[PDB]
């Protein structure tokens, strides 16, 4: 009934192509004969030309269909086109196709990472064990993932871990380094042997990613060092262990690629370069040299928390075959019109003429609801080509990265909804448009009508309503985040909401340059719009009141769309009901958000004109916002375990996610309610007493601290020299700080060596640390969660006293707090000029010393 002939040299990938073509033929009637009436010839060439990689031709000639694969991936993707054409038409006549993928690497990532740190381990550190990661040892579950990967014609799988080597390689010189028992090493060995075998037959490259500088805890416990400390120098020993470990990994897993992050535990770009050129690359060559390999297989290097151009500039004489990675829209998905300074980084990395991989990273602003908008994804990949000059793709899970393999969805009696079931369209869209981006958009709505229809057992025409829900709801998180968001970072969980404070005083919640300038069409923040209204300047670009208008029409339409289609389902009906609850969530969130912003404008108008009417107007709008948030909670309280999957104190917006708190809509309603109580109390006091609450400014009393590493003390007051190497003393100093006992360091010595403070305290203290506001690189940069997970370990992420210190012929400084228990402490501050102004047991009150900001009405 149907012959399937396989021609030439076997190879695992030709076999697999045949295995898959057989399955689908039988799976639809049709009897078969395999070999070397109606025939399909699978032909495979040897073709070196880097031009025809992953390419296939399909022609037909009477009763005989021919698939030419220019290489192993090519024949696989040839057989995929037959199968898809079969899946979409009745028939077994085949439309001729001559085709190759546009993007040369197309791939996705699984974090061997957890929602929370692990006792005795720092951020990103999770040994490969069945205790932490049962799912990693499940072969049934790997074949399901890999088949989804091949079906979407993705050719790369990236495993993300802080320090994977201690789980996978033994070193004679460091045999105590090992982070797993003997039985767990054997299973790691079996599971990588099986992963790479099974990925290979499917044309999938397996890529192990690691951060730096991180060592094993046993390695650390023995030598007396930490597993990781961002600002600690490179040492021969840590270097020797990392080098031998990579040499080992290469020898043992010759077909597994490496994705290097030169972060987040390396303090300067120079140390970033020393590490890659003197430790990693020498290590990769040790392995190649043992394997007797003349060639240089590609090594992948991220832009994250390094100077991408500096590091490739430095490395290419040592190793030709570098590929680069950079985030698409930072740690979120905001636009298909990215631009500005982040575009240029992409574009310089891209203008090497190698591979440059767009990382759709973390999707903080999508967590945790269903998101898979064909149109948004198509337009995005097109921007990757035209703006960013990317020619490859790496994609995170749509949501719940940190909790693989499960979505955050709450099912009856503790059943966990799985991520490969829920987010199929996500993987299928990125995969589709990575293969070919320019596809007739109307032709595309038919294909997606049938994809959503097949899955729910609905006709395509009725299923078009499912596509609208996805494309209408899909614009909401991106628009709100680029236009009102504090950060593209997972330091923010957009879909829990924002306080009025964060709408009327965004700069107080720290907004790094490059976010608003890159992750959307230009346009005004709410404070800029309102400042423009009161000063009668014209408005330029994308405006906040337009967006909230767009965003509630997105909500209304997505709801009207899914509500038509939801009871038609012959299949996955329970899932379709969770999609409908999701769209009602996005609608109530949109309306909550709309009314809140509207109220914020009204409080900003009070800021500029001091009309009381303005504040009165805000109350009804805050009530209505709260109504819609109360409606959100009913929908979420029985359908979601949480929103954010990073459930640590690295989550700062809308508030701390310390110890896993403040990770549900229910918890947030408690704080949003309090918000309005305070507001209506503050209004009432204005209307009786005509007084507001403002900071009372009192000196911080000096803690009873002893210093263990013989620092020089200085009193902090106008004139004190906190730098020994400049003649300039202090010429401005916040009243809070004067009196305190701080330290004198050599700024030159701080560039080369940093700043170790070693002290004991008999009750809890805050150390006050001055970071100078100056792009000159001689200055230590302030802590920054976006680049550095440990930047809130002492509660130092955001500053307490801004514009609080000036030294003559240096700069202005913000004061940051480093909070410590009673105990004995060592801490290395970033290389560069910086101040240490002393220690207080006292409560610290946030103040902009320059100044009364519009957001005391909420406190």
Ligand X SMILES: O=C(O)[C@H]1O[C@@H](O)[C@H](O)[C@@H](O)[C@H]1O
Residue 485 lies near ligand X (rule: CB under 6 A): no
Tell the smallest beta-carbon distance from residue 124 to Na ion (Å). Answer: 14
Residue 331 lies near ligand X (rule: CB under 6 A): yes
Helix, strand, coil % over all residues of the chain, rounded to 5: 40, 20, 40
Q: What is the DSSP letter of 658?
A: G
Residue 325 lies near Na ion (rule: CB under 5 A): yes
Residue 798 lies near ligand X (rule: CB under 6 A): no
Residue number with CB closer to Na ion (537 or 725): 725
d(CA 226, CA 217): 8
Tell the smallest beta-carbon distance from residue 646 to ligand X (Å). Answer: 6
State the residue for tokens 């409908």: 580
Residue 247 backbone zone (phi > 0: left; psi -120 to 50: alpha; other: beta): alpha
Residue 789 lies near ligand X (rule: CB under 6 A): yes
φ, ψ of residue 555 to 5 degrees: the values are -55, -65
Residue number with CB closer to ligand X (184 or 487): 487
Tell the smallest beta-carbon distance from residue 333 to ligand X (Å). Answer: 14
In sequence order, what DSSP letters do the residues of 781-841 get, joined into one string?
A: PPP-TTT-TTTTTTS-SS-SEEEEEEETTTEEEEEEEEEE-SEEEEEEEPSSB-EEEEEE-
Number of C-beta neighbours around residue 733 at 10 A: 22
Applying CB under 5 A, the site for Na ion has a residue count of 21
- Residue 666 interacts with, from Na ion, ligand X, none (CB under 5-8 Å by kind): Na ion
Among 68, 510, 648, 755, binds Na ion (CB under 5 A): 648
573-609 vs 460-473: helix crossing angle, rounded to 10: 30
From 211-219, 540-548, 592-600, 720-728, span contacting Na ion (CB under 5 A): 211-219
**Is the CB of residue 213 less than 8 Å from the CB of residue 242?**
yes
Q: Decide: helix, strand or coil at residue 52.
A: coil
Tell the smallest beta-carbon distance from residue 764 to Na ion (Å). Answer: 8
**Is the CB of residue 524 less than 8 Å from the CB of residue 532?**
yes
Residue 111 lies near ligand X (rule: CB under 6 A): no
**Is the CB of residue 72 less than 8 Å from the CB of residue 203?**
yes
Structure tokens at 685: 């006091």
- Residue 489 interacts with, from ligand X, Na ion, none (CB under 5-8 Å by kind): ligand X
φ, ψ of residue 394 to 5 degrees: the values are -125, 125
Tell the smallest beta-carbon distance from residue 162 to ligand X (Å). Answer: 10
Residue 179 lies near Na ion (rule: CB under 5 A): yes
Applying CB under 6 A, the site for ligand X has a residue count of 11
- Residue 275 interacts with, from ligand X, Na ion, none (CB under 5-8 Å by kind): none
**Is the CB of residue 219 less than 8 Å from the CB of residue 245?**
no
What are the C-alpha distances in Å from 9 to residues 6, 15, 18, 43? Answer: 9, 10, 13, 10
Tell the smallest beta-carbon distance from residue 489 to ligand X (Å). Answer: 5
The DSSP H or E segment spanning 470 is helix 460-473
Residue 489 lies near ligand X (rule: CB under 6 A): yes
Residue number with CB closer to ligand X (216 or 331): 331
Comparing CA positions, the residue from 214, 438, 507, 261 lying closest to residue 361 is 261
From 80-88, 523-531, 677-685, 784-792, span contacting ligand X (CB under 6 A): 784-792
Comparing CA positions, the residue from 531, 457, 497, 802 lying closest to residue 630 is 497
Residue 375 lies near ligand X (rule: CB under 6 A): no
- Residue 626 interacts with, from ligand X, Na ion, none (CB under 5-8 Å by kind): none
Tell the smallest beta-carbon distance from residue 123 to ligand X (Å). Answer: 8
Tell the smallest beta-carbon distance from residue 2 to Na ion (Å). Answer: 13
Interacting residues of 190 by C-beta distance below 8 A, sequence separation 6+? none
Among 57, 125, 588, 786, binds ligand X (CB under 6 A): 786
Q: Residues 611-650: x/- map of binding to ligand X (CB under 6 A)?
A: -----------------------------------x---x
d(CA 360, CA 398): 9
- Residue 490 interacts with, from Na ion, ligand X, none (CB under 5-8 Å by kind): ligand X
The DSSP H or E segment spanning 567 is none
Q: What is the DSSP letter of 202?
A: T
Residue 304 lies near ligand X (rule: CB under 6 A): yes
d(CA 389, CA 352): 10
State the residue for tokens 């909420």: 858
Residue number with CB closer to ligand X (473 or 796): 796
Q: How far does Cα 412 stand from its chain's mean position?
A: 30
Number of C-beta neighbours around residue 711 at 10 A: 17
- Residue 294 interacts with, from Na ion, ligand X, none (CB under 5-8 Å by kind): none
- Residue 773 interacts with, from ligand X, Na ion, none (CB under 5-8 Å by kind): none
- Residue 362 interacts with, from Na ion, ligand X, none (CB under 5-8 Å by kind): ligand X
Among 178, 180, 315, 362, binds ligand X (CB under 6 A): 362
Q: Decide: helix, strand or coil at residue 166.
A: helix
From 81-89, 515-523, 732-740, 785-793, span contacting ligand X (CB under 6 A): 785-793
Strand runs labelled E in 336-413 = 356-360, 392-395
Q: Residue 533, CB half-sphere, CA atoms under 13 Å: how many? A: 17
Tell the smallest beta-carbon distance from residue 581 to ligand X (Å). Answer: 28
From 522-530, 555-563, 719-727, 781-789, span contacting ligand X (CB under 6 A): 781-789
Residue number with CB closer to Na ion (376 or 629): 629
Contacting Na ion within 334-363 (CB under 5 A): 359
**Strands ordered across the beta sheet of 755-761:** 705-707, 755-761, 823-829
Beta strands 755-761 and 705-707: pairing type?
antiparallel
Contacting ligand X within 490-529 (CB under 6 A): 490
Residue 272 lies near ligand X (rule: CB under 6 A): no
Residue 747 lies near ligand X (rule: CB under 6 A): no
Tell the smallest beta-carbon distance from residue 555 to ligand X (Å). Answer: 28
Greatest extent of the chain over all pairs of C-alpha atoms, in Å = 97
Q: Decide: helix, strand or coil at residue 545.
A: helix
Residue number with CB closer to ligand X (716 or 785): 785
φ, ψ of residue 114 to 5 degrees: the values are -130, 155
Tell the smallest beta-carbon distance from residue 784 to ligand X (Å). Answer: 9
Comparing CA positions, the residue from 398, 435, 446, 433 lying closest to residue 418 is 398
Comparing CA positions, the residue from 102, 98, 209 lying closest to residue 155 is 102
- Residue 473 interacts with, from Na ion, ligand X, none (CB under 5-8 Å by kind): none
**Is the CB of residue 146 less than 8 Å from the CB of residue 107?**
no
Q: Decide: helix, strand or coil at residue 223.
A: helix
- Residue 325 interacts with, from Na ion, ligand X, none (CB under 5-8 Å by kind): Na ion
From 302-310, 372-380, 418-426, 619-627, span contacting Na ion (CB under 5 A): 302-310
From 38-46, 292-300, 782-790, 797-805, span contacting ligand X (CB under 6 A): 782-790
Tell the smallest beta-carbon distance from residue 823 to Na ion (Å). Answer: 6
From 68-76, 282-290, 504-512, 706-714, span contacting Na ion (CB under 5 A): 706-714
Tell the smallest beta-carbon distance from residue 708 to Na ion (Å). Answer: 8
Among 170, 637, 687, 749, binds Na ion (CB under 5 A): 637
Residue 85 lies near Na ion (rule: CB under 5 A): yes
Contacting Na ion within 808-847 (CB under 5 A): 820-821
- Residue 663 interacts with, from Na ion, ligand X, none (CB under 5-8 Å by kind): none
d(CA 499, CA 511): 16
The DSSP H or E segment spanning 743 is strand 741-743
Q: Return residues touching ligand X (CB under 6 A).
A: 304, 331, 361-362, 489-490, 646, 650, 785-786, 789
Q: Return residues touching Na ion (CB under 5 A).
A: 85, 89, 91, 179, 217, 302, 304, 325, 327, 359, 636-637, 648-649, 664-666, 706-707, 820-821
């Amino acid at each position: 009934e149907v012959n399937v002939v396989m021609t030439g040299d076997m190879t695992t990938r030709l076999a697999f192509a045949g295995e898959q073509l057989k399955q689908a033929l039988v799976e639809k009637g049709y009897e078969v004969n395999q070999t070397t009436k109606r025939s399909i010839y699978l032909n495979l060439l040897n073709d070196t030309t880097k031009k025809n990689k992953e390419r296939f031709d399909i022609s037909t000639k009477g009763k005989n269909t021919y698939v030419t694969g220019y290489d192993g991936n090519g024949i696989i993707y040839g057989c995929r086109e037959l199968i898809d054409q079969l899946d979409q038409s009745g028939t077994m006549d085949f439309k001729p196709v001559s085709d190759a993928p546009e993007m040369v690497l197309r791939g996705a990532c699984i974090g061997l990472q957890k929602t929370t740190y692990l006792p005795g381990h720092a951020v990103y550190e999770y040994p490969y064990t069945p205790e932490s990661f049962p799912w990693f040892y499940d072969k049934e579950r790997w074949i399901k993932y890999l088949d989804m990967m091949v079906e979407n014609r993705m050719n790369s799988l990236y495993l993300w871990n802080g320090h994977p080597f201690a789980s996978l390689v033994k070193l004679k010189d460091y045999p105590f380094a090992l982070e797993v028992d003997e039985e767990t090493f054997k299973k790691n060995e079996e599971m990588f042997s099986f992963l790479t075998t099974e990925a290979e037959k499917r044309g999938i490259f397996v890529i192990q990613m690691f951060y730096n500088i991180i060592v094993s805890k046993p390695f650390a416990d023995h030598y007396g060092i930490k597993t990781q400390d961002r600002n600690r120098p490179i040492t021969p020993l840590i270097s020797d262990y990392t080098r031998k470990s990579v040499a080992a990994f290469i020898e043992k897993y010759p077909n597994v690629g490496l994705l290097v992050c030169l972060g987040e535990a390396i303090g300067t770009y120079e140390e970033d370069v020393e590490w890659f050129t003197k430790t990693i690359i020498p290590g990769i060559k040790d392995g190649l040299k043992v394997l007797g390999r003349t060639d240089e297989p590609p090594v992948l290097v991220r832009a994250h928390d390094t100077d991408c151009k500096m590091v490739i500039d430095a490395a290419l004489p040592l190793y030709k075959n570098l590929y680069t990675m950079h985030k698409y829209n930072g740690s979120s998905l905001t636009t298909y019109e990215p631009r500005g300074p982040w575009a240029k980084i992409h574009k310089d990395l891209s203008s090497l003429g190698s591979v440059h991989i767009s990382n759709v990273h973390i999707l903080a602003n999508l967590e945790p609801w269903r998101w898979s908008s064909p149109d948004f994804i198509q337009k995005s990949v097109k921007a990757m080509h035209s703006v960013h000059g990317a020619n490859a793709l790496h994609i995170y899970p749509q949501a719940n990265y940190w909790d693989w393999p499960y979505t955050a969805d709450k099912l009856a009696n503790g059943e966990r909804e799985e991520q490969v079931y829920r987010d199929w369209a996500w993987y299928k869209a990125w995969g589709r448009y990575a293969w070919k981006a320019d596809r007739n958009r109307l032709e595309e709505i038919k294909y997606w009508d049938k994809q959503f229809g097949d899955f729910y057992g609905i006709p395509a025409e009725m299923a078009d309503n499912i596509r609208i829900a996805y494309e209408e709801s899909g614009e909401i998180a991106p628009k709100l985040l680029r236009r009102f968001g504090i950060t593209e970072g997972n330091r923010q969980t957009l879909l829990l909401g924002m306080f009025m404070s964060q709408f009327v005083n965004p700069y107080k919640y720290t907004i790094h340059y490059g976010f608003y300038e890159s992750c959307g069409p230009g346009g005004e923040k709410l404070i800029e719009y309102v400042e423009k209204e009161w000063k009668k300047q014209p408005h330029v670009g994308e405006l906040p009141l337009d967006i909230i208008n767009q965003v509630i029409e997105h909500g209304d339409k997505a709801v009207a769309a899914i509500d038509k289609v939801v009871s038609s389902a012959k299949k996955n009906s329970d899932e379709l009901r969770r999609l409908q609850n999701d769209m009602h969530c996005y609608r109530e969130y949109a309306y909550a958000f709309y009314y809140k912003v509207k109220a914020a404008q009204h409080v900003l108008n009070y800021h500029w004109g001091k009309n009381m009417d303005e504040l009165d107007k805000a109350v009804p709008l805050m009530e209505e916002s709260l109504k819609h948030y109360t409606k959100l909670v009913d929908l979420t309280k029985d359908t979601y375990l949480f929103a954010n999957s990073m459930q640590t104190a690295q989550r700062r917006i809308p508030i701390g996610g310390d110890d896993g708190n403040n990770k549900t809509w229910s918890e947030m309603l408690v704080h949003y309610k309090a918000e309005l109580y305070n507001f209506k109390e503050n209004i009432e006091m204005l209307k009786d007493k005509k007084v507001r609450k403002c900071v009372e400014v009192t000196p911080l009393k000096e803690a009873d601290v002893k210093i263990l590493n013989n620092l020089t003390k200085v009193k902090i007051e106008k004139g004190a020299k906190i730098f020994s190497n400049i003649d300039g003393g202090i010429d401005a100093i916040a009243k809070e700080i004067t009196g305190l006992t701080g330290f004198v360091f050599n700024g030159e010595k701080q560039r080369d060596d940093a700043t170790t403070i070693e002290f004991e305290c008999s009750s809890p203290v805050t150390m006050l640390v001055a970071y100078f506001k100056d792009d000159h690189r001689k200055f230590a940069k302030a802590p920054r969660l976006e680049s550095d997970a440990s930047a809130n370990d002492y509660g130092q992420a955001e500053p307490v006293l801004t514009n609080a210190l000036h030294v003559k012929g240096v700069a202005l400084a913000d004061i940051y707090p480093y909070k410590f228990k009673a105990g004995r402490h060592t801490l290395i501050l970033p290389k560069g000029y910086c101040g240490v102004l002393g220690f207080t047991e006292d409560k610290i009150k946030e103040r902009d010393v320059a100044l009364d900001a519009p957001d005391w009405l909420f406190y």
